Ligand binder design. Structure first.
Ligand code: C4N
Length: 207
């Protein structure tokens, strides 16, 4: 069964702003997603000190960037802590509201969309390049879930597909005019410019 949820008003507004605003510096979405992967990897590295059994679902702590020109998708995979069904919906809850509002006000005060991550809502920058985002996640304490949204004020959640052990996979179904983010040289340049100091291996898969 598929569950359909409405985004909180501020999020639906933020997502419309991101989609409708003229903003050429779209490449910032990647830094935001990598930064989110990095935080999940730190959380699993930290929980594994006190409880080593939390790494039974996978020892390797890494980020994989997977472009697929046939499906027109860019996949960002990590082996971080992952998210429970509760983490999924709770992170699309009241926490994001304060950040969204502060970001919304900053933009009116002259800040630009590249500052989105400082407000903890960097994920939504994925809608600068993606017409639809699918998020597959697996936490040690729960089952595998698939979150999906093409914006429009709603998102869906369902029990997920091939098992992934532990972590989060972000599948960006790119807009027709955003296929440059499938090119090896373009992804390399962006990772080098914005994510050069990430404390985890970043493997750019080739096709
Ligand atoms: C649909 C959806 C729902 C909730 C949050 C997101 C943001 C997101 N983008 N890329 C990610 C990669 C990840 O490994 C995680 C992850 O599993 N974490 C434990 C770290 C984490 C949690 C909350 C936030 Cl706000 C940021 C990082 C999340 C994200 C997207």
């Amino acid at each position: 069964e598929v569950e359909t949820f409405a985004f909180q008003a501020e999020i639906a507004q933020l997502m419309s702003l991101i989609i409708n605003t003229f903003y050429s510096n779209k490449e910032i979405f990647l830094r935001e997603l990598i930064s989110n992967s990095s935080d999940a990897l730190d959380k699993i590295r930290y929980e594994s000190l006190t409880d080593p059994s939390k790494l039974d679902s996978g020892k390797e702590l890494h980020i994989n960037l997977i472009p697929n020109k046939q499906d027109r998708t860019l996949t960002i995979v990590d082996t971080g802590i992952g998210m429970t069904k509760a983490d999924l919906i709770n992170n699309l809850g009241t926490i994001a509201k304060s950040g969204t509002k502060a970001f919304m006000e900053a933009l009116q005060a002259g800040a630009d969309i590249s500052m989105i991550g400082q407000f903890g809502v960097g994920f939504y920058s994925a809608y600068l390049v993606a017409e639809k985002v699918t998020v597959i996640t697996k936490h040690n304490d729960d089952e595998q879930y698939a979150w999906e949204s093409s914006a429009g004020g709603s998102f869906t959640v369902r029990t997920d597909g091939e098992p992934m052990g532990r972590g989060t996979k972000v599948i960006l179904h790119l807009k027709e005019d955003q296929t440059e983010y499938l090119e090896e040289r373009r992804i390399k340049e962006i990772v080098k410019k914005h994510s050069q100091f990430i404390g985890y291996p970043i493997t750019l898969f080739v096709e």
